[PDB]
Amino acid sequence: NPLYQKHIISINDLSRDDLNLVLATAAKLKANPQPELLKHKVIASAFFEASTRTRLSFETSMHRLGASVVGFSDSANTSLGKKGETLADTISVISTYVDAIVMRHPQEGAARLATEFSGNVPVLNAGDGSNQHPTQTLLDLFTIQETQGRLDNLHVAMVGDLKYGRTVHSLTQALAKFDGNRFYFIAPDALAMPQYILDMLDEKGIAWSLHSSIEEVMAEVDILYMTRVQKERLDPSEYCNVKAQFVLRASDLHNAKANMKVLHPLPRVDEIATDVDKTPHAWYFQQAGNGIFARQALLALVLNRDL
Amino acid sequence: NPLYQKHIISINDLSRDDLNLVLATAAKLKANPQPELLKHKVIASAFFEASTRTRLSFETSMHRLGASVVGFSDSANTSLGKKGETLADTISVISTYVDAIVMRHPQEGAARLATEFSGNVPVLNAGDGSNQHPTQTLLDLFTIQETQGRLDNLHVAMVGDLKYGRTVHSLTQALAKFDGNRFYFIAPDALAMPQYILDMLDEKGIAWSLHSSIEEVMAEVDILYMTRVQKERLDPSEYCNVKAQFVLRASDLHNAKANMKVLHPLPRVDEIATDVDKTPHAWYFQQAGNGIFARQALLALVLNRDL
Amino acid sequence: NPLYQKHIISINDLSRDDLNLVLATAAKLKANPQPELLKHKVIASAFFEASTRTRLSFETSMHRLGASVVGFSDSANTSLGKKGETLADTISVISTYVDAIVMRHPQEGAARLATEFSGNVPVLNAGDGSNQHPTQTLLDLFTIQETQGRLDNLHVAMVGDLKYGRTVHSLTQALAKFDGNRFYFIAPDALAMPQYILDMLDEKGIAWSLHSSIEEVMAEVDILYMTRVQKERLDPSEYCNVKAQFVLRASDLHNAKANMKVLHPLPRVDEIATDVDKTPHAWYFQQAGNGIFARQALLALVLNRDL
Amino acid sequence: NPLYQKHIISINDLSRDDLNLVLATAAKLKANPQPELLKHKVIASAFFEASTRTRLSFETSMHRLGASVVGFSDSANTSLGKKGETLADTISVISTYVDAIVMRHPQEGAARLATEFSGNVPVLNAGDGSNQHPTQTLLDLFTIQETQGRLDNLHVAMVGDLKYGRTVHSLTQALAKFDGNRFYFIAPDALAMPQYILDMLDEKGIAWSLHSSIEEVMAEVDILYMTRVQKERLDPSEYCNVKAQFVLRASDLHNAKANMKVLHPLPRVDEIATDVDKTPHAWYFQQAGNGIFARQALLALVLNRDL
Amino acid sequence: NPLYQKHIISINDLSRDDLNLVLATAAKLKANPQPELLKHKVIASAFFEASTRTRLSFETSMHRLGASVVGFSDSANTSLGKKGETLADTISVISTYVDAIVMRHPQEGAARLATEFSGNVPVLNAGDGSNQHPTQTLLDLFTIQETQGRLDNLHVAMVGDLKYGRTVHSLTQALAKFDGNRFYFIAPDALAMPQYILDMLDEKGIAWSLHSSIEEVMAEVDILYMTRVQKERLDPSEYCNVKAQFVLRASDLHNAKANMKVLHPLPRVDEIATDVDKTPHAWYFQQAGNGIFARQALLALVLNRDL
Amino acid sequence: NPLYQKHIISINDLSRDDLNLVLATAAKLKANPQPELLKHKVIASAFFEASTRTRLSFETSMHRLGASVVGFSDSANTSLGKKGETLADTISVISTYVDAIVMRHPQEGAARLATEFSGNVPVLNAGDGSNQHPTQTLLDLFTIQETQGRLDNLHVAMVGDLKYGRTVHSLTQALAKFDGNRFYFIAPDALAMPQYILDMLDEKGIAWSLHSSIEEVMAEVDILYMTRVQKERLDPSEYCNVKAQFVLRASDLHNAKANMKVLHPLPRVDEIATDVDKTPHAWYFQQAGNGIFARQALLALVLNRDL
């Protein structure tokens, strides 16, 4: 168990074998629950910015494995919020209480920074600004493997705010660990996929391309990964991109392949019309449900050495 | 068990037998706790408006039966609060996590709407604007039965904001399912009992009347059900009714019958003077305590098929 | 077990034997956990002002002993916050639900007041304005005993905001129960140790003195107890004292004794430079960690009669 | 010239001869302007609450007579607004600068209070909370005399917020100084004409009556004086009366007498439909225009001894 | 005198002869002031949105001609601001007081609307949202004629926010009334010159072109008219254009013609570096100073029939 | 006339002869008004922070001499307030309109800075943060000369906030220009008279001393100059000094000399009890009234060359 007590900060820190281990464990737990695997563990749920899916799915997963939970959903009633306490001190103190810390924070690098102050307590990154979202990627991969039967040789389009989308940074890096995947990036110029991601793809000799509409790749993709504009992260010089520039409607799916799935880490705003919800391609709610198995798997592996 | 996996949205959806089943189960649990009845259940506590009694009594009840709890007490740190997510999407995602959803929301019909998006997950309405409050009614009935020995042939006065009082809408409908109850409604004209409630009573041939003071019915009632003006729900054209128009003081109880109990779903503001708290008639804190047994009963029946 | 079902409001209400019992129990639990001691207990975590350490350490302690937790971290989404409910009514209702109430409130005397409305439910004071903080004192004593091997015949300096520091009021009273302790108080004139504390020391014939710098006592102390200026409690006529008047830096420790420990109930603001964190004297994070054992001990003793 | 250097605070302080003198002077100025009557006077325009008509008509009148103006339209940038200065000190200082003070203030009695601090400088009350509005009354009388040819033996209805309407308090008192006027008061019960006004009418043996609609007096009135609900002055227990309870529409004028005029001190909100503006009865804009002649007259008489 | 009592709302309503009359009058007044031309006039200065140049230059001009001024610089202390009065009623009442109304309002068409309610009182448009600014254009033309000796056969570049720039809408229309002018428009795509302006130029057979930098027209222009991004008028989908896209620096003027002048209606933000202020081309402060003569001229012509 | 077109920024820039010229002119105008001295002048009243006395007395003085006034009492509705315009640009533009600028601004050095952008237009400093208030000093000197018959060989106490009191900085410098004055400074340590003032007194060999109560100098002073704590200028580390530390009551005047006058530039807050107002020593309202003659004098001298 390479994941035992491992900090889970960036997909960059995980190997393909690490990913495969989590996915296999998640599949096993989906089939055979272990209500007491983490009995007598107490885990911190430390959310410094808003969340519905990530926090509630993480906490549910903790309880499904028998662990207890303490924490907060915003910093306003913490001593950090009201008394001037630093994040470093906050983590140091919490790490004397709990067996693991799940943390979401608006600043890039906050989770990595937390590991410097958490002593021997594993930190799991539930999102650090626009940087990384490794556990979203674990459930995304689980979902892709479940619907496509594999994680290699896929055609994957990512649409929307790729600049600020921590979801796509992690997912692109993860898929780049498998053979022969092909990427299509569709974003406003201002919210393009960051150069550092593209450079990584080039170093690996991975094929990718840019496009100005969903329509021009619709016939070719196995996975259409839609994203929300990260409104709360935008620089003022980017506010013209607040409205979704690419909106998916049911009619846009006319030439989609039979195996194609529309994914979306959620929440969605204007980028997916609700009429998509009724097509066989809509898979974002199934995807969200898979967060339970992916996160149970990760918690079990990080907190229980014996496989 | 007719309640197994049933959505609990409106008293209108429940039969008298349903009510009797919950009450009998609540009495049984009051006498013989079952700390593990709901072991391995995880329940969502989804509160979109303020609550003390309803949320904490519901969560306590969950723990008393061995269930775990995830959720929120306000929408501000959810993706609905900060990222523009719809309520429908919120429920859809939460329903992939938990075994039941307890939900309170400021908009009439929100709980019913949630059932359209919760898939196979039971929704329990902890209050939907000024509409329904079925679990308050369950504990009210439990309390009335406990102090009066029956739910039929009672004289019941309801006082205060009957227009916006979801408590009295549900309770009136429930009591209308039993034989021979007599209702006295005492409210400002602007906050009168809604016509749809009155029409229902007329269809059943149930006796009711309107009055302009507590004093004129005090000698006749078995139950005096006081309510708070629903200040946060009032239309501007109703702000003159913010102050309690009927205030109960200990001296007003001089001609009360020996069996008479003052109920109040709470919280109270100005409508009950604290000197009432010392009289044998004051029963609102006992009533609140009965929320534990009523809500345990409901949870047990909804989530465990075998009686 | 003298602590069984005892309200824990003020150090004034506890005897030296009471304190010794908690400390011995805490040491025992540190060595031999009891994951099921409080199984089937449900405890209220009722926080009406901000907290990181106190609330999370208390809740963790509850879970470590197998108890469940319900409550809130601020009053904003309670009926007290939104519907005008009194604190008295709030406590009365919560006390019908839970087996104990842990409460922090911004008003001096609030915890004592709560005991008047909690019926047969024990109230544990997690801080009542600038008055008392008994559980901070329990962990402080545990920490002092752990590093000094005793609680008598010590030289203890307290620095910073002693007027509003509920931490030092409780700790001074506790240490005054043991033989031969010597106190050094270092505070701005405006935030001096309250006269009522000093009078108590005089009645017991306890030696104490005032000083205008850390340096003048550094060579003599076993414990340097630093505090944060209670900014949110200051009268406007005291705002000049918001900035720490005594700042501890690593260089100030040049003549500290080898056994000397720097304590701080935390959070800290400007009063301890982070370079202190690396010296052998820094013990505030260890101190915070001891909150788990002290609070487990207190919960176990209050809620389980059999030792 | 009885008005020379007279404080103009309440209609109560003026005699019928005083009123007649202002009106005759206003008529004369309407016919023959005196651009230099007040040359070398400087007058303070001191407005502590909002105004369009009163302030701009007063200042225009000052300039039409050759006077200069200094002052403010709100207290926010005065030392009273930002530095904690009392109203008394404010008036004392301003009275060392100017030849007269025109003052509007939200508190009843403020203008009277100002006269205690203004030394030998005349104060003219442009409205003091819900109390008096003497200069509105002067222009109202001018307008009534202009359209009816007299101020005696009229039938005058006043409609709307009579409780808080400083306009109607002053106007009723003024009209009560002439022979044989008959009053009809039409107001919500909560905003009825104050008892002190009614008592005055009774002492003089003046006929008045209350009515619950405009329609029931429409055929009989010479003057229909409409008013705005004084929203910014209402007690919370009066907020149900924010919406106009009596709305005048053109169709309501079907049985109005040929000489009947609709007056309104303005601003109007919902109480007069704009279709009234086109009928021969609409006279509120003419009325507002007469503020120039009435206020010129008052200024000329107060500030220039020689008639 | 074609301008006598004329509403001055849009440049569209003025002829080339009208413009020439104002300019000739302005030149004459610049050379020979008439301190008493408008003695005994009172003019309203009615500003419903912010202004430095327009309001103060207009009021100064009024005083230079001997007129008096009443009004407001924001609507907050008017009855429109605090009592719910409509703009229409506001204008109707003010028009009974004054001899002319100068009005600036945030809504396009507000000045035109005012003329419907001002009776026989001339309205002068000091800016109506993003629509028209006729008096800015009068001073611009005066300034162009002063520096170029003519208003025909010029090369004029307009730069910045041409969509929301009421300044350039009026100025383009005015210059289109003279022979042979050539326009260069340099704007972000989102803030391009409105189609209705361009269509007008096409109808007249006027040469114009679009460009993406100042540099590409610098060598050819007689007038470089810079503008501020109208931040307070931008739609959210335009917020990316808040920062000036074209910034003029002294070094950019290296190939400017000797007669070239940089104009800017002001205020400027980031679009003109202060090092331009020292070059012979900088003429925006001279331009602002010419507002006095242009506005005196307009006031004199509108309010005094005899030339 | 050395003052003709002179910028009036700091008392430091004026000679004793300059001061004597203003005072003699003020006395002459007090005795013989000149209603047309400044006819055809237009002056800017540019107030960027709150004022009652300074702005209204300045504007009154302008009108008393026949000048007109344009300006603003706060920056909120200027283009500086709403459109991002710099102060420099604001002054540059205003200086093309008016014959002089009276300016008050919250930032030290703002008036001096304005002179760099005002071209040939004189700037008169009505207060620049905590720095200078030259026109307050002119009226103070006028008042001292009026009550003491001289400006030399006086005993003058200054009390309150001397650090932030622009009033006392200017007044101390002015009095230091005359022979043999003796100063007593009474202030909280935190708000002591600035060192740069004290150094100036030392360079001139002027006697001064510090005291901790009004009482210890009461018997010796000719002038008791009280001041308000400059609350809006205080650093947070000074907020303990918000309440007046020295409060003057009528009883404190028991041993005052018969010629002693209490001055206060006003507004006052808590530092002078209103019972002082009735004693012969109270002279602050007379002092404020003298602002008219001092400011008329200054305006006349600055704007009219011929004496």
Side-chain angles (χ1 to χ4, degrees), chain C residues 23 30 136-158 167-168 170-172 174-176 178 181-183 221-226 259-264 283-284 286-288 290-291 294:
Chain C
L23 301 197
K30 188 164 185 168
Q136 180 71 54
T137 282
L138 293 171
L139 79 86
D140 292 344
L141 296 170
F142 185 87
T143 302
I144 290 166
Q145 187 151 214
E146 156 184 285
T147 61
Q148 310 300 319
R150 68 163 88 205
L151 294 168
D152 69 286
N153 288 287
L154 297 177
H155 292 256
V156 179
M158 296 168 183
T167 58
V168 294
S170 296
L171 183 54
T172 299
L175 287 165
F178 299 83
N181 290 318
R182 167 92 162 80
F183 297 86
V221 300
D222 299 301
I223 298 295
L224 183 57
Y225 197 93
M226 304 289 307
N259 69 303
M260 187 281 286
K261 294 306 185 198
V262 179
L263 271 44
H264 194 314
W283 213 255
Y284 25 92
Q286 288 86 341
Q287 176 185 4
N290 284 337

Side-chain angles (χ1 to χ4, degrees), chain B residues 35 50-53 55-57 59-60 63-64 73-74 104 166 228 232 266-269 285 288-289 292, chain C residues 39-42 68-72 77-80 82-85 89-90 92-94 96-99:
Chain B
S51 175
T52 294
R53 272 145 295 275
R55 179 175 75 78
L56 299 175
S57 75
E59 297 185 19
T60 300
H63 294 298
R64 294 292 182 197
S73 62
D74 77 312
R104 166 173 289 200
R166 52 183 172 211
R228 176 188 72 101
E232 69 277 11
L266 302 177
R268 58 169 165 183
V269 177
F285 297 122
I292 292 306
Chain C
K39 183 180 267 300
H40 307 143
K41 300 298 175 186
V42 186
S68 294
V69 185
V70 302
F72 47 84
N77 305 134
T78 68
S79 284
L80 176 148
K82 291 299 189 64
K83 296 184 187 185
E85 190 164 28
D89 281 5
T90 300
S92 290
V93 150
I94 288 171
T96 76
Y97 305 157
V98 297
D99 304 319

